[PDB]
């Protein structure tokens, strides 16, 4: 029983699993580490480069770099290393026996899809592989075929509306405001408290701090007044070396750059304004449904209170007669993969696979013919 493989890639996270399963088998960060210190211990285990979950264990002696930034790959060799580690070390399955399903950002340059297809057929001898949109699969995971979806990952944020299973290409909006930039901003605003983080491992530590002790304020000025006038909004984080820091005021300051990019100084508008503009670009007749179905996707939208603030900010710009509701599934981190696990399981999808033999007469552009 040959089953398809679903591999979801994003800048900072790679997931993989068999089609038709509830859970992905492998989840690990998309990191590549190379040793930085002088290695002098003859006879014990050293390697040229560490990748995946093993590299995150040895952050002290490694320089950690990401192959993908902003949804665009920078070094393809590191991407090959991650794919090889996923196919061999994590799942222990042959890549040339089972078909593989791949996802990417909607708006992207020409060369990315062609290079990805060329590498996936030539290196691993994949009999069939298909490319799909991430946000469309997230909407399929929610199980409604219509509505506007917001997927904000660690690489890039994008809102696409899908009506009757079609994503309108003109109404797609993309904003380069992700969680890694929020991590950098949190590091910059933690500088003024007296704690200094400069290395890449300290960036991962700051990211863990952001994941554990951040939340979204309903009213920004009132929360500033409360945090200035009282010490109730203070939590203590415990560093891996035993030191204790107090996060204090900054907890609602780092995620607020999502709504106001003037803190980062970005020219573009907020994420809620981006969603509102994407709704404005569509036809009037469907706008009701676009205001009726909106789901949140991505790990960046796991900040507490994101749904209430999003609903309030959309309702502020919306007409008074419109009804605004926001859907937030609890498993919004892994929705995209779940959608892939739906899409490969259908009986009409076996003809949707790209043929290995057809690529021989077509070439690397074949995906633009079929997808």
């Amino acid at each position: 029983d040959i089953a398809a493989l679903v591999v979801d890639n994003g800048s900072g996270m790679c997931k993989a699993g068999f089609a038709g399963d509830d859970a992905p088998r492998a989840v690990f960060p998309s990191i590549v580490g190379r040793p930085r210190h002088q290695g002098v211990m003859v006879g014990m285990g050293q390697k040229d480069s560490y990748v995946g979950d093993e590299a995150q264990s040895k952050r002290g002696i490694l320089t950690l770099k990401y192959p993908i930034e902003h949804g665009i790959v920078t070094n393809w060799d590191d991407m090959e290393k991650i794919w090889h580690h996923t196919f061999y070390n994590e799942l222990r399955v042959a890549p040339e026996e089972h078909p593989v399903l791949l996802t990417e950002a909607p708006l992207n340059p020409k060369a990315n899809r062609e290079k990805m297809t060329q590498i996936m057929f030539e290196t691993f001898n994949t009999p069939a592989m298909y490319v799909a949109i991430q946000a469309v699969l997230s909407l399929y995971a929610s199980g409604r075929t219509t509505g506007i979806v917001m997927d904000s990952g660690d690489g890039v944020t994008h809102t696409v509306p899908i009506y009757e299973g079609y994503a309108l290409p003109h109404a797609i909006l993309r904003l380069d405001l992700a969680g890694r930039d929020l991590t950098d901003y949190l590091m910059k605003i933690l500088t003024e408290r007296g704690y200094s983080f400069t290395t890449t491992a300290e960036r991962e530590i700051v990211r863990d701090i952001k994941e554990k002790l951040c939340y979204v304020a309903l009213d920004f000025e009132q929360e500033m007044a409360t945090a200035a006038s009282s010490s109730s909004l203070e939590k203590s984080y415990e560093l891996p070396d035993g030191q204790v820091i107090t996060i204090g005021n900054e907890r609602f300051r780092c995620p607020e750059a999502l709504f106001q990019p003037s803190f980062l100084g970005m020219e573009s508008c907020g994420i809620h304004e981006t969603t509102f503009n994407s709704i404005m670009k569509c036809d009037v007749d469907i706008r009701k449904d676009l205001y009726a179905n909106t789901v949140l996707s991505g790990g960046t939208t796991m900040y507490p209170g994101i749904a209430d603030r999003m609903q309030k900010e959309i309702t502020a710009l919306a007409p008074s007669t419109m009804k605004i509701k926001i859907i937030a599934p609890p498993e919004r981190k892994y929705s995209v993969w779940i959608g892939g696990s739906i899409l490969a399981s259908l009986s009409t999808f076996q003809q949707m696979w790209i043929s290995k033999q057809e690529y021989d007469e077509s070439g690397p552009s074949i995906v633009h013919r079929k997808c």
Partner: peptide, 8 residues
């Protein structure tokens, strides 16, 4: 199936 039918 019928979105494959006319295009893509």
């Amino acid at each position: 199936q019928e979105q494959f039918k006319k295009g893509k």
